[PDB]
């Protein structure tokens, strides 16, 4: 997907237990500064499907990362001047699993990627992932002839 003018982010996945995210800046002729900057751990088996959600809030959107350990781990990508500053002397016992990845693309666009949610179930491997055009649901298809919609309900959060 894109962020705000020309800067893109690509999300690589396959054959291992991690998720790779790269970045590159566009130009009049081609692209440049194409390098791998993140390395997302958390999974237990291969990553079969992953997709971006559309940027509803300007500067804040989500990321689904489905995998072959029957889990559908989510991510969350924020923008400049909204980084959720941390690691200060009044630290919050950051629970190193939520270690809040951070990088720069060139110099003037820097992001923060943290962990959001984690869902069990699905009874088998999951195949395909889909978001919605407007609302905040998520479709998942598995390998045991099942198809279920996931939704964040109120008064619970999860």
């Amino acid at each position: 997907s894109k962020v705000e003018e020309k800067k893109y982010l690509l999300a690589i996945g396959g054959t291992n237990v991690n998720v790779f995210i790269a970045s590159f800046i566009l130009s009049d002729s081609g692209i440049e500064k194409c390098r791998v900057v993140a390395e997302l751990e958390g999974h237990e088996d291969w990553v079969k499907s992953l997709a971006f959600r559309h940027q509803e809030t300007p500067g804040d959107y989500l990321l689904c990362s489905g995998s072959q350990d029957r889990y559908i781990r989510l991510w969350r990508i924020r923008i400049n001047d909204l980084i959720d500053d941390s690691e200060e002397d009044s630290k919050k016992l950051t629970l190193l699993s939520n270690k809040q990845y951070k990088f720069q693309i060139d110099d003037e666009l820097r992001v923060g990627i943290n962990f959001e949610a984690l869902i069990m179930g699905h009874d088998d491997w999951i195949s395909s992932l889909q978001w919605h055009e407007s609302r905040l649901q998520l479709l998942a298809a598995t390998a045991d002839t099942s198809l279920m919609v996931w939704e964040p309900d109120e008064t619970s959060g999860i």
């Binding site: 630290k91 919050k92 016992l93 629970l95 190193l96 699993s97």
Partner: protein
């Protein structure tokens, strides 16, 4: 003791062979875990606190290491031991947060009621 008698004297013996010091304490019948977990906290150069605690929690049960890391009054060390302990993070992490913001002498009473050191708590 005799192994520790030589490679706790030179400054360069505890550089290369710092990992076998962890086994030399933790293999005793008094089970001197409090001196192994003391020299880990002084390791300031790199991430070698991670590589040593993952070796100390293999040859010993992890909650035995967790209760001993909790006893020498430094709470940032007890955090790294608990994440290796297959425990529910909603239990220990809130307990570790209440211990962080208090005063130091306020902490050393709160830390001893958990363990059973009632006389040491009372001081």
């Amino acid at each position: 003791d005799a192994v520790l008698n030589v490679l706790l004297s030179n400054p360069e013996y505890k550089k290369k062979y710092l990992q076998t010091i962890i086994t030399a304490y933790a293999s005793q019948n008094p089970q001197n875990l409090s001196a192994a977990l003391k020299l880990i906290s002084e390791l300031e150069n790199s991430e070698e606190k991670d590589s040593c605690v993952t070796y100390l929690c293999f040859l010993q049960d992890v909650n035995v290491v967790y209760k001993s890391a909790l006893s020498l009054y430094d709470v940032s060390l007890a955090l790294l031991v608990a994440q290796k302990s297959q425990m529910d993070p909603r239990e220990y992490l809130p307990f570790l947060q209440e211990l962080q913001d208090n005063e130091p002498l306020r902490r050393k009473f709160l830390i001893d009621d958990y363990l059973g050191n009632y006389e040491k708590a009372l001081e």
